[PDB]
From a paper:
The SARS-CoV-2 nucleocapsid protein is a multifunctional protein with potential primary functions of binding to the viral RNA genome and packing it into a long helical nucleocapsid structure or RNP complex. The SARS-CoV-2 nucleocapsid protein consists of five domains: an N-terminal tail region (residues 1 to 40), an N-terminal RNA binding domain (residues 41 to 173, termed N-NTD), a Ser/Arg-rich linker region (residues 174 to 249, termed LKR), a C-terminal dimerization domain (residues 250 to 364, termed N-CTD), and a C-terminal intrinsically disordered region (residues 365 to 419, termed IDR). The N protein mediates ribonucleoprotein (RNP) complex formation via two key steps: packaging of the viral RNA genome and self-assembly of oligomerizations. Previous studies suggest that the coronavirus nucleocapsid contains multiple RNA binding sites, including the NTD, CTD, and C-terminal IDR regions.
To determine the precise structural information of the novel coronavirus SARS-CoV-2 N-CTD, we solved the N-CTD structure at a resolution of 2.0 Å with X-ray crystallography. One N-CTD monomer is composed of three 310-helices, five α-helices, and two β-strands, with an additional N-terminal α0-helix in the partial electron density of the traced molecule. Two N-CTD monomers utilize three regions to form a stable symmetrical dimer, with a buried surface area of 2618 Å2 (of the 8026 Å2 monomer surface) (calculated by the online PISA server). First, the most distinctive feature is the antiparallel four-stranded β-sheet that has domain swapping interactions between the two monomers. Second, residues F346, L353, V350, and I357 of the longest α5-helix form multiple intermolecular hydrophobic interactions with residues T329, M322, and I320 in the β1-strand. Last, the α1 helix forms a strong hydrophobic interaction with other monomer α4 helixes, like two clip-bars, to firmly fix the two monomers (i.e., A264-S312, Q260-S311, and Q260-Q306 interactions). SARS-CoV-2 N-CTDs form repeating cylindrical high-order structures with six dimers, which is slightly different from the SARS-CoV N-CTD octamer X-shaped high-order oligomer pattern. The dimer of SARS-CoV-2 N-CTD is shown as a cuboid shape containing an α-helix-rich side and a β-sheet side. The electrostatic surface suggests that the α-helix-rich side contains a positively charged channel, whereas the β-sheet side is a neutral surface. Nevertheless, the conserved positively charged channel of the α-helix-rich side is thought to be a potential RNA binding site in the SARS-CoV-2 N-CTD.
Residue numbers in the entry:
A (entry chain B): 250 to 364
B (entry chain A): 257 to 364
Amino acid sequence: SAAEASKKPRQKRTATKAYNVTQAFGRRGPEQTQGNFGDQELIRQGTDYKHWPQIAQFAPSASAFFGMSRIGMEVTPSGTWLTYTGAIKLDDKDPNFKDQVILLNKHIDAYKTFP
Amino acid sequence: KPRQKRTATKAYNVTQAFGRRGPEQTQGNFGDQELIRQGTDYKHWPQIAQFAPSASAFFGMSRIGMEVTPSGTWLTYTGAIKLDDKDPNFKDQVILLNKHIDAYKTFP
């Protein structure tokens, strides 16, 4: 999958065991446009991760990405970039709210705790 | 239906699904009057949607945070997506995105 999955625009890629989060989206890190999400289990597995559906329930649809987010455009020496920022509210009345918080905390900035 | 999974259409438009356009943190700023009224029925929706991230890429590319605020618990996200200037459609993609970014500021 790697050679062919890598053919897609970055924002359309799907990470898997055969093409993991690092190969698709770069090493995790603190920099302003590095991704910071994923512990070692998610990084090596991507959408093969056992709880990927419980994570993906927070990812936005295309309509919601463009309806919810603050969208910008920056023209720089490296090219033309679409910038995005936003926030998705967790439903504290969802019976699984506490598990969702635990799941997100499991992966946010997790790279800080391993090489 | 969780806000992040909604899909806007002429019958259930961007305002109805996602709120009025505006400048504040949890408000969206994207879409002129036509896009707001039509959502994914907008004539150039597929050309906009090609920049929306897959679920894998949203969590792979973005800086993700979680915050408790005076209104509750939020997942925050930021990132940047590079347009492909080798794409013959590049010039039109820039025009299209530029047309909708902060369009509400000039609503007549």
